[PDB]
Ligand binder design. Sequence first.
Ligand SMILES: [Zn+2]
Lengths: 154, 78, 99, 60, 112, 128
Amino acid sequence: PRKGPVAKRDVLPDPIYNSKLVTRLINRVMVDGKRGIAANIIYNSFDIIKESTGNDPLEVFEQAMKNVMPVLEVKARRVGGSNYQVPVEVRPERRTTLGLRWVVNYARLRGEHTMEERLAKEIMDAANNTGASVKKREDTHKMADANRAFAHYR
Amino acid sequence: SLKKGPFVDDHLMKKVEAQQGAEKKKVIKTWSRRSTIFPSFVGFTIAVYDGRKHVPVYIQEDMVGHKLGEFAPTRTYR
Amino acid sequence: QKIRIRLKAYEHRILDQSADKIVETAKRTGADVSGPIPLPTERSLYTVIRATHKYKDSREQFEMRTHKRLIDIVNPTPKTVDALMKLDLPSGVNIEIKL
Amino acid sequence: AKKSMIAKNKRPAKHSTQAYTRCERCGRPHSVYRKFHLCRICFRELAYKGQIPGVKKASW
Amino acid sequence: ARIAGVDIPRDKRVVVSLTYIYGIGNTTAKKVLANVGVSEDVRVRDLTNEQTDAIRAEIDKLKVEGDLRREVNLNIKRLMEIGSYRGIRHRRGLPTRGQNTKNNARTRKGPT
Amino acid sequence: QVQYSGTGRRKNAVARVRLVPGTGKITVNKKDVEEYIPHADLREVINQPFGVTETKGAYDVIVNVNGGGYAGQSGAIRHGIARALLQVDPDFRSALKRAGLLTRDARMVERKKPGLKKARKASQFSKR
RNA sequence: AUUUAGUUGGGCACUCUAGCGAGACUGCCGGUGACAAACCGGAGGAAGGUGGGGAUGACGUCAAAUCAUCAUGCCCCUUAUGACCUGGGCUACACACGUGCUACAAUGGGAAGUACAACGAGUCGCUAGACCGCGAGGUCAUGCAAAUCUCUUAAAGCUUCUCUCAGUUCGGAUUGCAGGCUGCAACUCGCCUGCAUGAAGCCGGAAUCGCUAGUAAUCGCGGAUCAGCACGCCGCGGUGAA
Ligand SMILES: [Zn+2]
């Protein structure tokens, strides 16, 4: 915080596919100390995904991910005390963080009255580069290098 | 909420039955804040105390349900 | 057998030494004594706002505890019975002879 | 006025729903521990003086 | 028009739709249907012409009408025209217990 | 006869594990392990001791339990297993420690404090 | 071994209860360091580097607060500003603000089955059990001044079915009627139940608050004052993130 960086609390793998990413995604759906429900919508969404175009709940998942995880980011810094936003070389981990964040959040507004159809359709559309999360990453990369001229030698 | 019968204080009953023979005297001063209304009261004229002044009010028929305190309001707003 | 004694005080030293005394008065004459059985030690709680007019932030909470013991005996001879009847000390902890 | 009031309670009340609690040495009307019959502050202080058997400070 | 006084919807579930009519809550519908011996049927109601008459008969044994309001109206009328503090504050809306009104208008008038 | 024991504690819950040679099984309070447990597939959690020693069968488990929630005591059986396997061979404890799962998690609910709505929550507070 | 059961035999092994002890001290390893203090990593160990938490508040600042807990100089009332009783206030409502609770639903609404804590209260009080009324409850009776008996099988949880995106079966403010409890007495001015009616309200600007872990978020339990009345306050525990 002020002294120095701090530890990071790694998670356990999943009890079905044994994936650190799967657990790290189940956690980012839970709301208010209620977990089992999140696991249930995860598994049901996974089965729905594998149903139409059965390849894997994991492989198409990573496809959608690499479609999303960005490579730059505007980092507002007042080196000149002004509204300088300098493109930053985003770290490895925060990339996955933002992947999951955009996925879940922006999928929450997809709008299937059904419980988990929202997620499944979202990642299936992302793996094929259709959907605003893909547009979100491309917008981040289009605002980065939109001003890399005066914000790079820093 | 008193299903073991209603209630009116005795220093009003004896003072309201005492007219059942003849005509009624226009005045029955009281405290007038703990008594519901019984059928034996119709046609009287009871003044009602509001902590400040007694309020003279007659007795009609349908005005028989509630307690005595719902006619001299102690608020006086306006 | 047909006799036992409860203890309820605050400082454990007095309770424990009363325990030792009664065990002497029991296993002296006869035998078949039971040890100083511990017990759950009920506890209380209060909360006093540590001010006098305002500032309901500053709380000051107090407490109370009641250690307990328990001892039964078997085959009480007339000797130790009357020794119990005569033993009264200490006088900081309340005991009660009970069947 | 505390003297007329204190004298009030020592009598048997006019009706049963009238016998409330009030400290003995002091005379606070509110918040008297009806296990001790002390007010809030008087018990607070007297605890310091080592004159209530039992009560101490509670750290845990 | 439609089936009981007025106000019955189409393409719904039965027991829910029977609550719609003014004066029928939820217990009323279940007990009424009990006295016929029916069920949901189903989510688009497909009643038979005989069941309709059965319910039209069992309903006409209830004070609930498109007229329940007249009784309530006359009751608050008897109220407001004798004393009446309850009736007086019923010219301005206060209950059987009062609630120390310095917010209790946000449900009656939109005071702000 | 031969019987093996070991205890476990988590979040103020405690389970009294009992081990014996079998096929790989556990009867929680005379019930199948999938009864006491809800839906919970935190069963890899429970067999996780086995996934490192005596991999991954096969003994049986008698188990009593009381206290805490389900997740608490569920995690609290995990440690009777560790202690039992420890009873068998004191040649295993190194590979247990390196993989951990041997020391008692002392995290527990916090002693609250007067003046704060929760263990640390501070009430919203008007500035001016 | 046997019974409905740890009950009853049998036992004190375990669990737990609670006294006395034991244990964490940079104690040993490597390194950095002027060889010092200290610092980075290691073994062992349940915990490693003030292990986690609390109680504990220096000189003084602010003529901060308090003669209404109590005390007290001075000034004052004294057939009245002292005192007794009934009735009403402190609960008043065009309005402005601070703190909280319930919500705007599909991780949801309803219906049916299914398990798991912890802290404490109890003699004029906790009610067992059974009977009655759909309910708040009533009737007769049962133990308990206590690890025995009761409050009290905790609720979210887990398993099925129905409801389909609507001011909706969401929301239940408000109001009519009939009841229950304590109470000498519930209009002013109690808590709760049943029926009936069914408001605003579909995530909230400028602005602004809390929070670094068993925390935040969320769900229940208890008790202080107390015939009676808690969304407040004081404690406990369950689930469990970034
Ligand atoms: Zn006092």
